[model samples]
Target: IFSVDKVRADFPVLSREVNGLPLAYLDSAASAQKPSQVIDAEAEFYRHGYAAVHRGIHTLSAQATEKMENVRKRASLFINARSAEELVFVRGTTEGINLVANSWGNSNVRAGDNIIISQMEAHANIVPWQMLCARVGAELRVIPLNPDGTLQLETLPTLFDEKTRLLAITHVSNVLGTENPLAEMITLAHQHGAKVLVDGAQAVMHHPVDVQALDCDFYVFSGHKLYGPTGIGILYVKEALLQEMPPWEGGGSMIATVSLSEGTTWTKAPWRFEAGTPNTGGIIGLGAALEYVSALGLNNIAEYEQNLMHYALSQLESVPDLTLYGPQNRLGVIAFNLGKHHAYDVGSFLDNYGIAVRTGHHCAMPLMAYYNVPAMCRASLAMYNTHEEVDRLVTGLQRIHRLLG
Candidate 1:
């Protein structure tokens, strides 16, 4: 409905084929297909704009560093965070969460302190806290999910108390596509005097994110999932919190002065966290990706993705014995299981038709175990996806269903 032909043109891979069949990509949640703008930008940066940033006065280095810093500013703006200084470049959401967990979690969550996470959390979110809890003797608490795949609001109140250090949660479920009520959860955590960290790897591409408005202490997202290059991601920590937390990593650029006897003076929260040479080319490429996305407008992207989701869900609803997972109100992803059809087999069959859909636990094994689903077939959407693509997926599903039958 939203000029998908024009939209699809931006991504060259969509025009390719698999064994003589046209491609229909529906795996945005795993990693998005990059557009030509982002691809060319990265290529151009390496071709002509390559240089180390931040620690050099050379002209090439100066220009590259400036562009790199500009990416921080743009990423800050994208999330409505206060400033570039508040953001740190990391590998991706997993590393960002681990950084915060080790730093703030170690300092704040002592013995008996509660670290609340949801059943829907990725292993990245869960394992970091598990290690932190073990280090500090803090108790790890998990908020349970309802039968419909939504978090049970009733389970949260008693689980979190003043002893709660932080609530590690996802803004959107990578497996179920359930959009968490983050604003409300943040308020709840605050009322109990706890901070909140939002894992936004899957959410940022699906909808708008305003960290300041969300009142989250830390927000993490992966650039690769946002239609950008890999080896680059961001962590936005609130200024007040950053001031209190120590740097998770130690090295050269993170210090104002280092001496053999006087000890190292830390520069600041973000710089302290980003030690050594960063992924310079990837950062600049991320900036180009953000520039490309901003011009497209996030609200417009959200609406288009939602429309595609709705269309996909409707088509899937007609398939016999297929059970859709997650809340009825959700972001642009749908996870479902066809009765007696192995999820991976379904995905494999679809692949034979040149349609790619994610199949498995989706990095939320605990959630999979909680729902009693061994695995699921997940089709996630981005702004570049379309109704025709959705229809192709539906057609692919029909063929898979028939084959198994």
Candidate 2:
């Protein structure tokens, strides 16, 4: 079935010690620890197969190009994208949003048009649209949140109209671990004559994603979050949209030819957007990571994590003076504070106990502002995490509260 120890064995870093205690990693929402399969796969590429992909007849170049392209195919299958052409490799989710906001925004959006985003968006999702709207003299609208930090859907209908150009939303909130009803949200936006771009950074790591069935205009997630190397990510553009949206960044390998007299003609999309050279090693690692995750089975991962989440949530509430955030049905993330102590201090204390958790705005300042708190401590989980680690987190909090409070 789902064996945590068997899975943990593949991750070399799991056995390492920190601060005289066994390490407890719970910051996966920020990024996941790499497995040997990913590391060795990346190293294997650079060890012998290194080369600039495409535009070469030599053996190494041919091998690298084929392998990299195959990674794209694997990623497409992993997400169930309609076509491998739908996937565009980038630095991460931030760059993915910027690509659309810059290229697609300039192409389609205009003055007096509006873009709607929810109150729970990460800065990556919010800032790009904000910059785009400012550039085109468009309005930026927000979907309000209820006191529980969930979206207030009653007013969602009122926020959309004829002038609404797009609705940018997050699949799972980084701060709250809340998964929004994306299918329903996307359906509503489409009815209002608008498009949808999903920030799947948090959601994809925990569940399966199908772009065709979900019907999102755009979708993105980082390789690092999926246990692949850092530096690589995916942006899924519906095939029709990719054909229309021009490349935001242009350079070598993205064009057919360049001549001042005749001007320049660009190559087809997926490549046009790639621009310059890509992280071939990272892409290979991402392929390995996706295969590893696929082998484990997403449904198995989801079920295992959900059970642990409930146990972790209930255990944390037993500790005095600890405040848990978000809905009871939250997954992967638990953001809380120990007294009024600055999150940095609490984070440092947990580090001393060899427990790793993220503390701060988590790149969602708007959510922090809405909740009237500067920051909170986040212990985000993954399949590698165990109930013992969750208990370690609870004990760490209790000790911190006793000494500080």
Candidate 3:
């Protein structure tokens, strides 16, 4: 086993207390806690060298530009993208989806085309398509899930048809911790002459993502969840699709040349997609975070996290009155309820016990509706989390169950 103790030392927050006891943070799905390396690297950039990228011809500008592009390269490699130039930086997953929905949706999708999504999707993955569909006069189709919170593979064939233009799905569900079969879904979508846009905000941190291998038209993920800085994320568009799609945002630096006589000819997809000044510092810091994660190895992280999830499942299963949600093969995210106790109460009780977990709908109101639950307590883990922490959670939940019920 790797030295988790040594790993714990790198996170200063792990040493702190929530109430009077040592903190056991289990909310990585909402947002991950940064390690010292990521924190320091971000601070290092701001403290030592901070400048805008790609606008000027000065030394600082050149350095900044190089750093910005270098970060793109690092992020692309992190996902095993075909090339760095195929990657487009967005504010986060929301912006990345919105970019595709507004720009590509506006261009490719027609009045009678269909937009398909699953019932297990987050609001981030839902609303953009809804908005785009409404404007495009398209129909929204939803794939149903099984009772055990797994995708009903049987329901998939019925969901796709001749009119389907786009199928937007989450690679891993934020609410259920279910990792969807991406390759199968992508292949299914392609057969109907539809494009696949994967919401990878939840999956990117858990395993290796080869966008080219997946053959997905678009793959989007947030930087913060992947141990990178906030205010930055990636949009990996297939070169074929990206080259054809029109730019979403319009501003300076997106154009090769602008003329008063004719409307401007926008630059290529990646640059055309990125308009105005970007989150330069966050992008650079993201590069540092990517480098750190790359050194650790995605395969190693996946195997270790799988072990953590198994331990988490076992621990939660032992707790009386705790109805753990989702599949056994899920990532280290446990969404459950303690019998009749409200999710907020359980969360408050856990908070007092120095355990940080999420409570509520988890931005998946439709998913919550589908599961026939009002709210739930979610404990999401990362590689930094230990088996002892899972034990801590099990104990805490047991106490809360007795105290409340």
RMSD over all Cα atoms, model 3: 1.3
Ten contiguous residues with the weakest lDDT in model 3: 1-10
Q: Which lDDT tens digits does candidate 2 get at residues 1-405? A: 799999999999999999998999989999999999999998988887799897579988988899988999999998889789999999999999999999999988999999999999999999999999999999999998888778999998789999999999999999898899999999999998799999999988798988888999999999999998999999999998899888788789999899989999888988999988898888999999999999999999999999999999888887887777788888789989888888999999999999999998999899989888999999987999999999999998999988998
Instruction: Note each model's CA RMSD in angstroms.
Output: 1.4, 0.9, 1.3
Which candidate, 1 or 2, has the higher TM-score?
2
Q: Write one digit per residue (lDDT tens) for candidate 1, span 28-65.
A: 88999889999999899889978888748888889988
TM-score per prediction, in order, is 0.97, 0.98, 0.97
Q: How many steric overlaps does candidate 1 have? A: 0
Q: Which candidate ranks first by TM-score, i.e. highest?
A: 2
Q: lDDT score, residue 146, model 2?
A: 83
Models ranked on lDDT: 2, 1, 3
Which run of 10 residues does model 2 get worst, by summed lDDT? 317-326
Give the per-residue lDDT digits (tens) of candidate 3, residues 1-405. 455677678778788987788899889889887778888987887887777776577787778788888888888888889788899999899999999998899998889988999999999999999999899899999988887788888977777889899999999999788988889889989999999999999998888889888999999999888877789999999888889888777888899889989878888768988889988878877887787777777788888888888777766777887787788788758889889889999999889888899999999998888778899989998988988888888888888777777
